[PDB]
């Protein structure tokens, strides 16, 4: 990587990445845990980099009607980027098409709702009532895991729920009440810390990792993997999570 330039796919997803839309230029528009990881990788490996957001602003999923990807995954497959630098969740659909780096964080699917004393105990109960609406963000990992789960009642949840645009839209809808938002534990923990009237529905389910995405046969995988492992071993990943997560 010494002398190399990496085009890095990313999107805003706090606290992993924050993207300033004004008042900044280039790489300095980005901040967060993933940015701090990238900065240190760049310093230690000697590459320059830039961040490239997908035009559709999605993480990426495989459309089963067209068999085409979108989001950051598609940009990587199209060779618009060399690596996806974000909290990229590991799933088998993506693994068919791309590789992952060594992982930096366990994560699960988590569901939350506004209003203390919710009667719900598990998300599948949502199918048997009409007091609460619910949803997941389109073309993002939770949607994919629910659509691929063995119990096709999870596909019903996705298909019969609201398709949310992004985290801001989801949180807005959640705060409007009578709405169960299903997403990822670490993202919900950070972003809903001050919402004392938001509570969990059931326990977390599904076991996966956050990692970076790499194209198959990338010449950079071995080095990125080594360095990410060293970050974890040296305590850097935990230090960054303490820095960035609330609170």
Positions touching a second copy (CB under 8 A) are 90-92, 95-96, 99-100, 102-103, 106, 145, 148, 150, 206-209, 216, 222, 225-226, 229-230, 232-235, 237-238
Binding flag, residue 234, Mg ion (CB under 5 A):
no
Q: Please report how close the Cβ of residue 188 comes to a second copy at its closest, in angstroms.
A: 20
Q: Which does 234 bind (CB under 5 to 8 A by kind): Mg ion, a second copy, none?
A: a second copy
CB nearer to a second copy: pick between 198 and 228: 228
DSSP 26: G
Give the DSSP letter string of 142-207.
HHHHHHHSSSTHHHHHHHHSEEE-SHHHHHHHHHTSSEEEEEEHHHHHHHTTT-TTEEE-S--EEE
Q: Is 238 in the site for Mg ion (CB under 5 A)?
A: no
* Residue 178: Cβ-neighbour burial (10 angstroms; 0-12, 13-18, 19+): middle
Taking the least distance from each CB to Mg ion, the nearer of 106 and 203 is 106
Helices (H), 13-140: 33-45, 71-77, 92-97
Nearer of residues 68 and 106 to Mg ion, judged by Cβ = 106
- The partner in contact with residue 95, picked from Mg ion, a second copy, none with C-beta cut-offs of 5 to 8 angstroms by kind, is a second copy
State in angstroms the smallest separation of the CB of 74 from a second copy.
20
Q: Tell me whether residue 145 or residue 192 sits nearer to a second copy (CB atom).
A: 145
What is the C-alpha to C-alpha distance for residues 112 and 77, in angstroms, rounded to an integer?
A: 33
Select from a second copy, Mg ion, none the partner in contact with residue 229, using the beta carbon and a kind-dependent cut-off of 5 to 8 Å: a second copy
Using the minimum distance from each CB to a second copy, give the nearer residue, 111 or 174.
111
Q: How many angstroms separate the CA atoms of 31 and 144, rounded?
A: 27
∠ CA 38-44-45, nearest 5°, is 85
Could you tell me if 227 and 45 are in contact, meaning their C-beta atoms sit under 8 angstroms apart?
Answer: yes
**Contact pattern from residue 59 through residue 98 relative to Mg ion, giving x for each residue in contact according to CB under 5 A and a dash for the rest:** ----------------------------------------
For Mg ion, the binding residues in 92-121 under the rule CB under 5 A are: 106
Beta strand 205-214 pairing with 99-100 = antiparallel
SS3 74: helix
- Nearer to Mg ion by Cβ, of 41 and 228: the residue is 228
């Amino acid at each position: 990587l010494i002398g190399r330039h990496l085009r890095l796919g990313s999107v805003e997803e706090q606290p992993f990445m924050f993207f300033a839309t004004e008042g900044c230029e280039g790489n300095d528009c980005w901040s967060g845990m993933v940015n701090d990881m990238v900065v240190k990788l760049s310093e230690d490996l000697g590459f320059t980099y830039e961040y490239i957001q997908p035009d559709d602003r999605k993480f990426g999923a495989l459309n089963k009607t067209t068999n085409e990807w979108n989001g950051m995954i598609r940009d990587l497959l199209d060779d618009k980027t060399d690596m996806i630098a974000i909290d990229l969740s590991t799933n088998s659909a993506r693994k068919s098409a791309i590789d992952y780096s060594f992982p930096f964080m366990d994560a699960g699917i988590k569901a939350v709702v506004k209003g203390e004393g919710t009667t719900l105990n598990q998300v599948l109960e949502l199918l048997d009532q009409d007091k609460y609406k619910w949803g997941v963000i389109g073309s993002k990992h939770p949607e994919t895991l629910l659509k691929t789960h063995r119990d096709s009642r999870y596909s019903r949840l996705v298909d019969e729920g609201v398709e949310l645009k992004d985290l801001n839209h989801a949180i807005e809808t959640l705060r409007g009440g009578l709405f169960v938002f299903i997403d990822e534990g670490p993202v919900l923990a950070h972003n809903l810390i001050s919402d004392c009237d938001v509570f969990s529905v059931g326990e977390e389910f599904q076991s996966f990792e956050y990692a970076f995405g790499l194209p198959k046969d990338s010449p950079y995988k071995s080095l990125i993997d080594s360095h990410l492992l060293k970050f974890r071993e040296e305590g850097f990943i935990d230090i960054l999570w303490e820095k960035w997560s609330s609170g």
